Amino acid sequence: KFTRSRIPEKVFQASPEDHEKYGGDPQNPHKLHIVTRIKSTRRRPYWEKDIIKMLGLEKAHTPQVHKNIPSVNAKLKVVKHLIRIKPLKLPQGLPAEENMSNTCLKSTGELVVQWHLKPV
Amino acid sequence: SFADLGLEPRVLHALQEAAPEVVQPTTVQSSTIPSLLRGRHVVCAAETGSGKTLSYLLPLLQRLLGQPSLDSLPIPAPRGLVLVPSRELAQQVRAVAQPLGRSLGLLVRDLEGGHGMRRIRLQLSRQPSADVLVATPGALWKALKSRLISLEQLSFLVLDEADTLLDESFLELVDYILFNPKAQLVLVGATFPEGVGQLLNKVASPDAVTTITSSKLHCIMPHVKQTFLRLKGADKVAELVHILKHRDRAERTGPSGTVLVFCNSSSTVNWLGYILDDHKIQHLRLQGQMPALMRVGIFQSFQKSSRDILLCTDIASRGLDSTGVELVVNYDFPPTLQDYIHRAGRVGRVGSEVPGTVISFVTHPWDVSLVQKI
Amino acid sequence: QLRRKAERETFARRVVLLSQEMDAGLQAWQLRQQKLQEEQRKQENA
Amino acid sequence: KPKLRFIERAPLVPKVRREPKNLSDIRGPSTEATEFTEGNFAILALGGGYLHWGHFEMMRLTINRSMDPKNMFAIWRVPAPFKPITRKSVGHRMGGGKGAIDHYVTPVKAGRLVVEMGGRCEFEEVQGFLDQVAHKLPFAAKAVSRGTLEKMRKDQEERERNNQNPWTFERIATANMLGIRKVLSPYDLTHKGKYWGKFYMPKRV
RNA sequence: CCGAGCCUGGUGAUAGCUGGUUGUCCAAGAUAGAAUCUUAGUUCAACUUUAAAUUUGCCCACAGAACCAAAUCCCCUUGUAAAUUUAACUGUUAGUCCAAAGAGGAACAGCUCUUUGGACACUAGGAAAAAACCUUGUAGAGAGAGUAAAAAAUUUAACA
Ligand SMILES: [Mg+2]
Ligand SMILES: [Mg+2]
Ligand SMILES: [Mg+2]
Ligand SMILES: [Mg+2]
Numbered sequence: 001k002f003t004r005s006r007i008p009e010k011v012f013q014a015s016p017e018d019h020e021k022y023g024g025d026p027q028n029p030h031k032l033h034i035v036t037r038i039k040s041t042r043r044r045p046y047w048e049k050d051i052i053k054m055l056g057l058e059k060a061h062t063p064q065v066h067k068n069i070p071s072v073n074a075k076l077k078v079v080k081h082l083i084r085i086k087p088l089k090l091p092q093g094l095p096a097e098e099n100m101s102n103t104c105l106k107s108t109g110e111l112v113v114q115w116h117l118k119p120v
Numbered sequence: 121s122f123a124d125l126g127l128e129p130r131v132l133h134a135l136q137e138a139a140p141e142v143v144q145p146t147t148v149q150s151s152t153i154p155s156l157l158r159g160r161h162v163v164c165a166a167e168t169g170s171g172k173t174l175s176y177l178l179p180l181l182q183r184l185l186g187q188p189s190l191d192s193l194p195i196p197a198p199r200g201l202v203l204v205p206s207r208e209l210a211q212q213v214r215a216v217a218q219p220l221g222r223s224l225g226l227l228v229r230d231l232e233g234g235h236g237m238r239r240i241r242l243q244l245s246r247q248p249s250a251d252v253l254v255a256t257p258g259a260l261w262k263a264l265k266s267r268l269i270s271l272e273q274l275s276f277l278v279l280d281e282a283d284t285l286l287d288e289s290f291l292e293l294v295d296y297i298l299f300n301p302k303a304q305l306v307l308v309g310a311t312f313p314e315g316v317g318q319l320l321n322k323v324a325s326p327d328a329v330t331t332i333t334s335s336k337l338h339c340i341m342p343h344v345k346q347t348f349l350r351l352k353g354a355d356k357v358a359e360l361v362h363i364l365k366h367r368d369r370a371e372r373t374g375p376s377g378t379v380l381v382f383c384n385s386s387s388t389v390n391w392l393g394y395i396l397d398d399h400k401i402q403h404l405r406l407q408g409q410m411p412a413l414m415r416v417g418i419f420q421s422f423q424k425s426s427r428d429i430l431l432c433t434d435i436a437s438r439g440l441d442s443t444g445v446e447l448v449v450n451y452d453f454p455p456t457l458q459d460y461i462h463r464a465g466r467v468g469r470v471g472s473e474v475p476g477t478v479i480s481f482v483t484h485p486w487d488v489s490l491v492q493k494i
Numbered sequence: 495q496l497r498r499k500a501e502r503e504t505f506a507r508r509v510v511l512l513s514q515e516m517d518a519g520l521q522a523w524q525l526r527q528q529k530l531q532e533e534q535r536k537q538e539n540a
Numbered sequence: 541k542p543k544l545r546f547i548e549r550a551p552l553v554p555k556v557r558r559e560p561k562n563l564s565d566i567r568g569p570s571t572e573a574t575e576f577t578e579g580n581f582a583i584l585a586l587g588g589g590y591l592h593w594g595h596f597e598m599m600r601l602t603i604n605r606s607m608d609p610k611n612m613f614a615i616w617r618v619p620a621p622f623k624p625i626t627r628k629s630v631g632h633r634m635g636g637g638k639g640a641i642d643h644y645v646t647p648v649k650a651g652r653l654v655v656e657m658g659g660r661c662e663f664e665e666v667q668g669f670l671d672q673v674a675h676k677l678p679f680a681a682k683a684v685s686r687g688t689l690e691k692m693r694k695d696q697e698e699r700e701r702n703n704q705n706p707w708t709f710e711r712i713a714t715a716n717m718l719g720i721r722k723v724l725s726p727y728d729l730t731h732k733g734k735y736w737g738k739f740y741m742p743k744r745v
Numbered sequence: 746c747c748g749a750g751c752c753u754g755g756u757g758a759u760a761g762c763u764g765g766u767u768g769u770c771c772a773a774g775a776u777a778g779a780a781u782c783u784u785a786g787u788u789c790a791a792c793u794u795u796a797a798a799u800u801u802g803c804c805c806a807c808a809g810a811a812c813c814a815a816a817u818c819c820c821c822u823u824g825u826a827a828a829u830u831u832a833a834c835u836g837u838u839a840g841u842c843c844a845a846a847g848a849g850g851a852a853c854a855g856c857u858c859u860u861u862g863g864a865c866a867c868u869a870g871g872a873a874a875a876a877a878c879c880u881u882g883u884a885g886a887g888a889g890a891g892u893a894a895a896a897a898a899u900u901u902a903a904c905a
């Protein structure tokens with residue numbers, strides 16, 4: 001009987017060796033997370049299909065993001081096996097309305113304050 | 121097994137007396153007995169004569185053991201009641217209850233219409249009050265209308281042939297009988313048609329259901345061989361006579377040739393019985409039109425298996441637990457497939473062990489029953 | 495190019511709104527905790 | 541009595557009601573009768589199945605054919621044939637349920653010890669007879685002494701503790717990592733990727 | 746053309762039987778049960794879909810759900826968008842295959858028969874060929890680019 005099946009809480013239990021292996025720290029978590037699809041909407045639970053629909057993941061291999069709330073955490077972990085998340089960082093400040101236009105996303109995590117036209 | 125039910129020493133000794141026919145409880149009996157001993161109001165559909173009456177009675181005996189004798193004061197009604205649709209079924213139930221209550225303290229009584237009401241309403245029958253009483257609905261309704269019995273004193277009710285008790289002739293008298301509503305209600309049957317079960321829902325509150333065997337149309341017993349009559353009705357009785365000639369072989373070997381014939385109409389049963397008695401067959405006929413004393417004598421003879429050929433009307437299709445039932449002929453195929461299956465389960469009522477022969481005649485109205493035969 | 499600009503403005507507006515939501519949620523959680531502590535302190539009098 | 545007792549085809553008390561043949565009674569590594577019981581050598585079942593009176597009688601014939609009762613005693617640890625496997629009428633209409641019972645057989649899962657051998661004899665001399673029996677056995681098995689089973693258990697523990705894989709069967713499976721739950725068995729959390737149906741893969745470290 | 750002459754009318758006879766039934770473009774839309782002299786058909790049954798009228802649904806968290814395993818149902822928030830009565834017609838119901846769960850038969854079979862989940866009778870690339878396995882989903886053109894699934898591995902008997 002295939003179902004939305006139970007998985008342990010240890011799947012979301014990190015390790016200090018893991019936090020070193022990953023780029024994460026136990027303190028000061030991420031403010032917003034990003035997500036993407038790299039697996040088929042086909043051949044999973046239809047419940048999970050509408051879950052990915054709820055995720056705004058009707059595109060695929062395209063970026064999207066949300067606020068990584070615990071409810072959002074559970075929603076993502078429901079469809080985690082098909083999806084990927086990213087620590088959608090922003091080393092600079094958040095985009096002010098004065099700087100409303102010049103923003104972008106560099107895949108390592110950067111949100112651009114001003115993506116100008118000349119190099120460094 | 122039976123010891124899992126915590127039977128009393130009288131109950132354990134009676135169960136040991138039921139050996140080798142009872143060495144352990146049946147699986148349906150295992151499912152039924154302690155849940156009833158849990159006091160839950162429920163209905164159980166299972167094999168006829170599968171010890172289901174004993175499974176209901178053992179938990180009833182345990183519940184009556186927890187009941188005080190002070191409710192057994194004079195003039196009141198019983199606390200343990202059972203219902204049967206036929207006087208013969210009620211008499212058989214009362215006879216079975218009197219064996220178990222010989223080593224117990226429960227008083228067992230029977231009530232049915234067409235019998236002596238002086239003995240029914242006797243001072244040691246109605247007024248002294250009993251623990252176990254199996255009663256027909258008509259006699260009980262007459263007693264309640266005449267204040268010869270009560271309904272506030274009941275504590276454990278059993279509905280045998282509850283589907284037959286759910287008959288349109290039988291539902292109104294049962295509802296009139298329906299009375300303390302907190303009593304523990306248990307119903308027993310062979311199968312539950314849906315249109316009657318919701319009728320139970322008219323007087324139900326979170327009950328339980330215990331079903332046995334296949335959940336589909338459990339038409340064919342694995343221990344019963346069945347045949348289809350590929351011939352017209354005109355010589356079919358003659359073919360039945362030929363089957364009687366075949367039953368002549370069954371009369372030859374001593375392997376018991378107790379034959380039960382299904383007849384739809386009492387007058388048709390009388391005509392067929394006059395033909396068979398004319399045909400030098402040792403046949404006895406029981407019907408709803410038979411005299412009550414004559415029916416009682418015929419039922420006692422069939423209990424003794426005195427008449428190897430016995431015809432039965434619509435009054436005697438289901439519920440039968442007859443020893444040595446080896447020959448069953450639906451001389452008239454039953455108008456209900458449930459009725460045909462119930463007549464089939466009436467024979468070989470010792471369980472999955474005692475074998476028997478089944479032959480059913482086929483008529484034109486039963487042509488649509490051929491699809492039911494599929 | 496205008497399409498990419500609009501999509502960028504969309505992602506920026508979403509991130510900003512989520513940031514404001516998270517900040518207000520933390521502030522509300524702290525305010526609720528402070529109110530609960532004040533009520534617990536004021537429920538031990540008279 | 542330093543000899544193998546005869547196994548009957550069916551018990552004196554029969555089985556009145558029909559019953560099914562569940563593969564789960566042979567599926568999985570068995571826990572009962574897994575170690576030596578008053579024995580220094582036996583045959584550990586390297587697979588699941590059911591042994592009838594025929595396989596038991598062949599084993600008893602092969603044991604009593606080559607045994608020294610003053611030095612080697614053998615006791616069959618498995619029970620007699622008890623599970624009723626039936627067969628229907630030949631040339632009967634297809635479907636329609638089950639007929640009378642055909643023959644009895646007792647089912648044994650993987651890891652069960654079959655015949656305990658003891659006395660003034662080692663497993664090395666009886667190794668040839670045990671290998672012939674195992675090749676002729678109903679299920680796959682392995683002739684193991686009292687110390688051979690311990691050596692195998694220690695080798696398996698060493699193989700398990702010396703694993704170098706960056707991904708393990710439980711490490712993706714119990715995690716339900718990449719949607720293998722679309723194919724993962726409900727009982728697959730129990731064999732840990734070692735028991736696949738009727739075959740038993742102890743060689744997987 | 747004799748197993749009941751031939752022809753004309755009656756005769757567009759009749760069977761629920763097969764098959765075929767004509768140009769385009771947008772909106773929605775694929776498998777549950779019960780009766781039936783019935784399974785080659787039809788009727789109660791559900792879904793829809795549309796037209797109108799009336800404001801919360803799907804995903805869930807606590808508690809709770811029985812005596813003779815996976816679980817499942819009622820079920821605050823979260824994210825996301827539709828839901829309840831009244832009506833009309835049609836249309837499926839004889840589905841296939843695969844992973845799990847049972848019953849039968851050899852524990853033969855592109856065998857049967859009920860529950861759960863998919864896809865499937867509907868695109869493209871790959872497994873050599875490809876109704877079913879993996880990826881992938883949905884509209885056009887460009888002579889750019891990134892990417893996904895992606896070709897099987899492999900061998901031995903030394904001994905004091
Ligand atoms: Mg209804
Ligand atoms: Mg049905
Ligand atoms: Mg014409
Ligand atoms: Mg026509």
Ligand SMILES: [Mg+2]
Pocket residue numbers: 760761762
């Ligand atoms: Mg037709």
Ligand SMILES: [Mg+2]
Pocket residue numbers: 488781
């Ligand atoms: Mg009909």
Ligand SMILES: [Mg+2]
Pocket residue numbers: 488782
């Ligand atoms: Mg008819």
Ligand SMILES: [Mg+2]
Pocket residue numbers: 783
């Ligand atoms: Mg028809």
